[PDB]
Amino acid sequence: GEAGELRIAVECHTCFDWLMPAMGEFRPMWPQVELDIVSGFQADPVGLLLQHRADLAIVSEAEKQNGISFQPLFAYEMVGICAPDHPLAAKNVWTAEDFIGETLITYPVPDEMLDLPKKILIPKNINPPRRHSELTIAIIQLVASRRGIAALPYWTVMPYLEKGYVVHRQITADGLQSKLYAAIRTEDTDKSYLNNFCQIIRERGFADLPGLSELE
Template sequence: MSFLEIRHLRTLLALAETGSVSLAASRLFLTQSALSHQLKQLEQGYGMSLFERKTQPLRFTAAGERLLALAHDLNARVAAAERDLARLRQGEVGELRVAVECHTCFDWLMPAMDAFRQHWPGVELDIVSGFHTDPVSLLLSHRADLAIVSEAEPQAGIDYQPLFAYEMVGIVARDHPLANKRCWLAEDFAGETLIHYPVPDEMLDLVRKVLRPAGVNPARRSSELTIAIIQLVASRRGVAALPYWAVKPYLERGYVVARPIGERGLSSELYAAVRGDDGGLAYMQDFLATVREQSFATLPGLTPLGAA
């Protein structure tokens, strides 16, 4: 009898996506020692190594690649079966209107929506047009069914589901003096022009978590588009703080330089807000699962969030 379990296969998928034991353990809400013990059991059971541990990122052996292929196949089959059961229980049709409050949400939201449409073709999926500073109010007035928000503020009739956390990095032109610093502190922004999206300060984690507590209020400039902000930074018109996954392609091309903000970095969070009565809908739960799965598989530097 095989001792291989679905949890083992999900561990392999997390390892493949994160490239490290520590990040995979965080993704699966396990301790690193528990995950290492699970991997040791697998290798002892099969009598061969599944990984080359001294590589970064971690690299699978031929045996590991074979189990990883099984993990991809079986995980997709299990997810499809569970969706079929959910359709039988709750039906296949519905409406899911999504409102967002973050300008960079579309980078990861659109691929997740494309995948979801294949799972639930009978659900009418749409994005509520425009950028919304208070998307939760759209839920309460039934103008939206799900809202992507950065804070889980308690509110009657609203449930929050954690999506993921991500790192915000400071970006600067390659020849800017701040490019030579290991990380940036609040005072490093004092003499700079901060370029950001045109949103209230309460929605800017850099301002809310770093600058305001330190009494730093730099000059400002705003732009609607991420690429426009990066272009302004590259032209030494100012500095900015953006999600690492959003700027990574431009870092690889050498357009700008990124540095951590603070000794421990600056972390931001995203949650899905839904009406309490809708949280149990099968297609709603599958949409949230699809968002997490797609995001963790494609965006660098994400970490899981606990329940709100």
């Protein structure tokens, strides 16, 4: 691996759906860049960049920090999912208070990593009963079986609406939007391969995922 390395730090589960084929396209284009995944810490991946433990990080915030540079990837809606005969299917928009009684199905990661609890529930002092799964396919089947509700990107939810497993609803009057960024060290802003990996993620996402919007 003459060129060097691209150690990707990612703690976001849905990210893998577009990140894994992005790596698959990058690899033949840059065969001398050693690829790696630095995952499973359940903490902010920006720290790993500062610690030289990772070369690029997939992040939900472009929180200004010294020594690190942010590159916008894309934004998307976080939709609420319930079974078609669940009482919440009657509401077009789900308020924070609509989550009170319901079991929430999420990835086994802390609330700080989850957009819905962090941006909507925690500030409103709402902590609903939780159910966890490492797999999206298991989350959908649990939701469909009325074993709880979940918040997932619209693009992820899409194939399952067609199969009639779940219905999707707007989370909050303002909606719930996730913003995705690629973080690198400021000293690495000139590496073509790092910049080209981000353009691969963007071209692939915008062509494969519905409901994506440009990030300023």
